[model samples]
Target: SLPDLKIEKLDEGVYVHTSFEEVNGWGVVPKHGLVVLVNAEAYLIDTPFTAKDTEKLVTWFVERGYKIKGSISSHFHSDSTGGIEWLNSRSIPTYASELTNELLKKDGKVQATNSFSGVNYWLVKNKIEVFYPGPGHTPDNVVVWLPERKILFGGCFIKPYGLGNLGDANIEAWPKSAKLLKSKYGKAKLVVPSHSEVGDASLLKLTLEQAVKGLNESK
Candidate 1:
């Protein structure tokens, strides 16, 4: 069964869509994504946890008069790539990194329609910047940046409030990834994480500290 979906206004022209899914032992957990509206065009940061949830999300944006330009998955996880297939079925341009696509293929999941490496803007100029800062949560996980607003969507790499499942994480590289991310997007006024609360660049700091602590404890 699908949990109730939610959409909250994060900033002007930016909204956060949340979906719930039951984890193995964590019960129901919320997944977050961004809905960026520019010139009435919607750019999805990640998809909801399920296809139906994704459909409902798209409907919400459509009912509000925003035409979806494209969707970018931050990683290959279900929370990120869950709606890619559905979005593609609707002929909406979807994007993921080449490594994410390869991992998707290896995992027998749907791949995005387009692949972007490093920093690239999709559909708009200087509005959204997709950046891959090494690896943390997953080898292909990437972050989304809204340069105009100084907002950084850290996705799963920027932990909301969890050590959750780090089975797929690159523990050694995570802190470095966080350091690089902080150095690059240090001025982010707002930071959105995939699973929990949204905060400022301090979330990046938290992630870095968490990674370092996790690494040390494992020693």
Candidate 2:
């Protein structure tokens, strides 16, 4: 059986999906994604590791009369787009940044559709915005902004304090991009990272500090 998918209620129409895996020999790692449901219509920020796991998520909502309208990625990693093949099979649109598509071109058959750059608004009640806050985890990594809920899905870009480690990051540009993200989303009351626990704006502040420290120590 695929790993069980769990959820945590954040606010009305907002929930956090939790899953775990030992990705790419990275050892056991915890993963989290955001789910936004509005009037039975739902949007996923990321996806569980496999098609089977994703099916469980879809079924849970479908059985409850929820529509799996679409989903966006924080990056091109499987942790985010692992279910793209599953989603596309259902004719459900999968969205991601243009950079994500470019970088993931060779990710075999798994892919995302409806790629766009900058920001986009999803549904009236949801008010979901996909923004590429520069690059941290990857050049294509983007953040999902819920202005209404004051939540920012930082993905791998902004990690929890002291639990951060660069993975395929553009070190020269990581700190700069993270700084831009902090200033741009200064109003984010609750911030969610791809791994580790959720935090406040302090997450971004701490991420900047860590990025600088990590790069300096490497040199």
Candidate 3:
């Protein structure tokens, strides 16, 4: 049986779905992705790890009239792009960065249907900006922000307190890249990470803590 998805609302038009993910050597753990409901349609930030879980998510929203308009990839990693094939099979529009598409192909993952550069305000209704603040958790990592709501989806680039690693991370760029978000979005009220619990501005500090830890451990 597939594990069920859990939902939590962070703000109006902004929701998150919690699902299970297997981190190579770390064992199975719960992870989440953002779901934005706007204009009576829904846009997914990234995909859940498995196709089954992705199906459940889509069904949950569709049954509620979400339309599941499209989906976005934060990076090339499986957790972000893994369910593209399944989503695409449903004919939903898929979008991502050129870097994300480039690395997705390099990583042998299915690619997003469309690509963009730098920052873009997608989804038609919400002025959410998809920005590449530099590298961290992965070379193509991207963060999603709803400018009006002050909500930032850090993906896996930023981690929760005491629960992070350098796995495929750009350690040298991680620090500056993570801090870049604070400098850019200082008023952000809700910060969502790809895995574990959500937090506020201090999440950046915790992310920086592990980046330094990972850097030292690698030495």
The per-model lDDT (C-alpha) reads: 0.88, 0.80, 0.80
- Looking at model 2, residue 200 earns an lDDT score of 92
Question: In model 1, what are the clashing residue pairs, if there are any?
Answer: none
Instruction: Output the lDDT of residue 128, model 3.
Output: 66
TM-score for each predicted model, relative to the true structure = 0.95, 0.92, 0.91
Best candidate, TM-score-wise?
Answer: 1
Quick one: ranking by TM-score, best first? 1, 2, 3
Counting clashing residue pairs in each candidate, in order, gives 0, 0, 0
Clashes of 3: 0
- Candidate 3, residue 80: lDDT: 78
Off by over 4 Å in 3: 119-126, 162-165, 216-219
lDDT of 3 by residue, 107-218 (tens): 6778889888865545554566787878888888888888788888988887756536556778888777777766887677888988767888778777777776766776
Model 2, 181-218: lDDT tens per residue? 88898878999988878899999898888877766877
Global CA lDDT computed for model 1: 0.88
Ranking by lDDT: 1, 3, 2
Q: Of the candidates shown, which would achieve the greatest lDDT relative to the real structure?
A: 1
